């Protein structure tokens, strides 16, 4: 899944 700071 995506990193804590992605998007």
């Amino acid at each position, epitope marked *: *899944e*995506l*990193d*804590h*700071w*992605a998007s």
Partner: antibody
Amino acid sequence: RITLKESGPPLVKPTQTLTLTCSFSGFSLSDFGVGVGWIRQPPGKALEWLAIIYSDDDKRYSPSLNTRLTITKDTSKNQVVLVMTRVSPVDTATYFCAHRRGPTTLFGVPIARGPVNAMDVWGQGITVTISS
Amino acid sequence: ALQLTQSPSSLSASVGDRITITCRASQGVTSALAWYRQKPGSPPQLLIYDASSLESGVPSRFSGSGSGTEFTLTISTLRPEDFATYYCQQLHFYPHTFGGGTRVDVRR
């Protein structure tokens, strides 16, 4: 100045539980978006990511080790603990904890996320041998 | 999961050379990539964060570029302390993968 240091048993026997402590200074795990992660390095091998925990208490684990890892923090003692259960010989490695910056803020407003893309300060590492 | 492949795995060079190490990801990781240098017996040390930003206190001969799936670290003028192993790390997807490393040793 940020510094981290790992502590725990240098020797552990197969099937046992390994508890590693990362004690740090220079930042608080209550600071905005900060993270502390754990990475290991078997002798002569590559670095392997294990887990990380952030100040808002979100936790993430390596999928390959998920079932054997627990990471937790003790904000008031400035420590992060990683518990690995059921160790076996392949878990012998040098274990490092490391700091991860949170986004830069301006008047308490997040304005730059580029600084979170790295683990910027590392502890010296603690060597753990798993043998009966 | 996501794969990070470093090239070359090993590289020989001499003081004063310009070297470049590359790291390729199996899926795009945007700019969330970091480079480290690790000397024998020591922990890895951060050189470049966010694909190209120079970490504070790190000498200017180190440079990082690229985004997406292909990144490169170049050391413009190799110094003796640079004979070491370099690693790239992706921080876009969990788990936060490391490449296999590239060993830089004294050419002869």
